[PDB]
Amino acid sequence: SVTSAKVAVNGVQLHYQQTGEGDHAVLLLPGMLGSGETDFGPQLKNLNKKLFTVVAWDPRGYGHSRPPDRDFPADFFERDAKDAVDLMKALKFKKVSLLGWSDGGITALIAAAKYPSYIHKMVIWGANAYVTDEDSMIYEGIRDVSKWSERTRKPLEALYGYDYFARTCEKWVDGIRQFKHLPDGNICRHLLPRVQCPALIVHGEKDPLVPRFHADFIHKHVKGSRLHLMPEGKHNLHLRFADEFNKLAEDFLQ
Numbered sequence: 385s386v387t388s389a390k391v392a393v394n395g396v397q398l399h400y401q402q403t404g405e406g407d408h409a410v411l412l413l414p415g416m417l418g419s420g421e422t423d424f425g426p427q428l429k430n431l432n433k434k435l436f437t438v439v440a441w442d443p444r445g446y447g448h449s450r451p452p453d454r455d456f457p458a459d460f461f462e463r464d465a466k467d468a469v470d471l472m473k474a475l476k477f478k479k480v481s482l483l484g485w486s487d488g489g490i491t492a493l494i495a496a497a498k499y500p501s502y503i504h505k506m507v508i509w510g511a512n513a514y515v516t517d518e519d520s521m522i523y524e525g526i527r528d529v530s531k532w533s534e535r536t537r538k539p540l541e542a543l544y545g546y547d548y549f550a551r552t553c554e555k556w557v558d559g560i561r562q563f564k565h566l567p568d569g570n571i572c573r574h575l576l577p578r579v580q581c582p583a584l585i586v587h588g589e590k591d592p593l594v595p596r597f598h599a600d601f602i603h604k605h606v607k608g609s610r611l612h613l614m615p616e617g618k619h620n621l622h623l624r625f626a627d628e629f630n631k632l633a634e635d636f637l638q
């Protein structure tokens with residue numbers, strides 16, 4: 385059973401889902417336009433409820449954390465990272481582990497680096513710490529939700545309605561473009577060496593959105609990290625291979 389609610393954090397009413405009675409608190413961080421409802425069903429259902437207390441949050445402007453509407457300032461990943469940690473603190477957790485997917489993995493990396501005393505362990509997949517020319521072709525190619533996959537679009541179109549979905553996606557691409565102009569096309573290359581907790585980087589070898597060199601780079605610069613490659617995994621490996629992923633995550637977190 386899962387409970388949904390909102391809590392006031394940094395001027396916004398953030399929505400989140402929570403389940404479990406475990407003493408090990410875990411936050412599930414969704415990707416672009418994601419939410420606990422669309423990105424973490426299998427985890428909120430199957431992660432061990434005796435071992436963990438699981439929380440899946442909706443970044444401001446995403447999921448049900450509306451208003452406000454989503455905007456992408458130069459520091460939007462850092463703003464989400466602060467909101468995520470403040471949300472867990474508002475929920476009274478003294479320390480937490482992070483499971484971050486894609487943009488959520490980027491967010492998790494930043495949170496671990498900026499609030500090291502609050503993060504126990506971290507599991508991230510599909511994240512990229514910077515943008516290259518190869519990446520540009522990829523994100524520019526997804527700007528138009530019209531060309532998106534029918535199966536991948538349906539859930540977001542249902543949650544937000546076509547208009548908000550389409551527009552926010554365009555604004556997301558515009559936000560990423562700004563990183564390309566910065567030195568090293570940096571998003572969080574500089575924070576990787578500051579992650580002090582045990583980290584597990586998972587990557588689907590058939591991931592069509594994030595080239596593997598991005599996972600290799602994060603693995604290289606996050607001290608003590610482990611890199612797990614899934615031969616058949618794509619970008620949504622925690623959903624397509626949920627039992628395998630959940631087992632992997634549960635083993636690492638304990």
Ligand SMILES: NC(=O)[C@@H](N)Cc1ccc(O)cc1
Binds near residue numbers: 416486487522593594
């Ligand atoms: N779903 C998300 O959170 C995006 N980070 C996925 C993505 C990665 C790289 C890209 O070039 C484009 C899209």
Ligand SMILES: [Mg+2]
Binds near residue numbers: 568
């Ligand atoms: Mg450089």
Ligand SMILES: [Mn+2]
Binds near residue numbers: 420447
């Ligand atoms: Mn929600």
